[PDB]
Structures are given as C-alpha cells and as structure tokens.
Amino acid sequence: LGDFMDKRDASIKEQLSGVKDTSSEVKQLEEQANAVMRAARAEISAALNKMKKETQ
Amino acid sequence: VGQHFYWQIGGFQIHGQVLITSWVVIAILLGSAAIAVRSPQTIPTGGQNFFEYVLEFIRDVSKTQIGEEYRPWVPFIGTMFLFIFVSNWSGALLPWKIIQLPHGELAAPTNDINTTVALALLTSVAYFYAGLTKKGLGYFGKYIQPTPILLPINILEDFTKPLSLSFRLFGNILADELVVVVLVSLVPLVVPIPVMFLGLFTSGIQALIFATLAAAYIGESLE
8 A cells, every 4th residue: 555655646646747848849949949940941041141242 | 241351261361352352443533543544634624524623623633732842742642632631432432242251241341440440551651751850850759848747659650640540440330330331120111211311411511621631631731
C-alpha cells in the first residue's frame, strides 16, 4: 500500500512531467517558428542585396 | 469485575486474558487486509477505501510530528493506532456474557496491566532506540544541562513517560469498562442507551489522541 500510494503521487508527478515537457518544447518550437522563416527569408534577402550591388 | 488473570500457566504464570483478546483483535485487524483489495489498484476498491485513508491520515499526523525521518516509523504509528482503537472497539463493544471463561474474565486486551505497560514500554524504548542512532552515542538519555537544575533529570521524566501513556490508557479502558457494567448491574439494558453513546464517544476518540500522543513521543525521539 505504500507502493500504491507513492504510485498515485508519482503518477500525478508524471502527468506534470509530461505537461512540463510540453511547456518546454512549446517554447523551443515556437522560437523556431518565426526563426525558420526569418533564417530562410533573410538569408535570401541580404544575399540578394549584395549580389544585386555587385551586379549594379 | 475481575481483571487479574486467566490460569494459563507457562512456567511463569502468564495471563491468558491478555492472550485470547490480543489474538482475536490482532487476527481481525490483519484479516481485514483482503476483504476486497487482495489485488489492489490505483483506482480505490473495497478494502482500499478503508486502508488508504488511514494511511494518509497517519502520514498527516506523523510527518508533521516525527520529522525528516518519517519513513522508518510509518509502521510504528499505524500499528499502535489501528490496533488500539479497534481493540477499544472490541473492548467496549464486543460482548462475552452468556459464555464465561472458567478461569478469568475477558472483554479487552488493554484491560490488564501487562498489555498497556508492554505497549508503552515498546514506544518508550523505541524512543530510546531512535535516540541511539539519532543522538550522541555517549549521552542520549541524559544529554541536556541548563544552568544546573536538571542534573538528575531528562531521564527521570522518561522513566515514567512510558508509565505515563500506560496509565493513560489504563484508566481510560477501565473507565468505559465500569460505565458499561454498572448500569446493567443497576437495571436492564434499555435504560443506559442515552449514555452508551457517551461510552462510545471516548472509544472512538482514543484513535487520534493515542496516534498523536505516541507520535509526539516519536517526534521528541527524532532529536
């Protein structure tokens, strides 16, 4: 019964740990979210600016 | 009316009135463990709904009191608490009238001196065993000294603290014993029913008070 009770408490802790993994990976991916468009688009844009200068 | 003995000789004249009562109450307590919860569950079940509430209550009254080292003493609280209050149920509630033991008189375990002095001595030397590991191995019982007023003391008090909780339960079981027997000795059973609920009051109250009492001794014992 001690095992069963600490299993209850650790099950609460484990669903909390799943919600915490969710909350951390949300921050990571949502940082990636605008950053992927920024990386691709600005890498095209500034390289375009420099190529356009040398071709002027 | 006679609390002394059962004539069960064991070489050294042991009391059987303690023996059979202790046996039956111990047996019912250990045998309620699998009324419906022989395969326990996270989702509470038949016996689970009984046992787990008691376990959580014991954790409540113990970890606050006992201290950081709560776990080595979780049996210590639950055994004494459950055993004593269920045995008080069996002592104030369970009848044995029309069949009487030819040697002695049996209604309760804690009736005789030996039962409760044994339990009290158990708790108090458990305090001392706690102080063995959890205090200076030189001085554990006679450690403290203020500006000297306590030179023979801190052990004279714990000489009688076992005696304290023993007599505490002594008089309280003899209390409900006498209150139950005297009104039936006066007049038939249907008249004392107004105060049989009073006799049941302290019978149900002894659970939490003895739990926190010996748990307070154990919380002293953490040191």
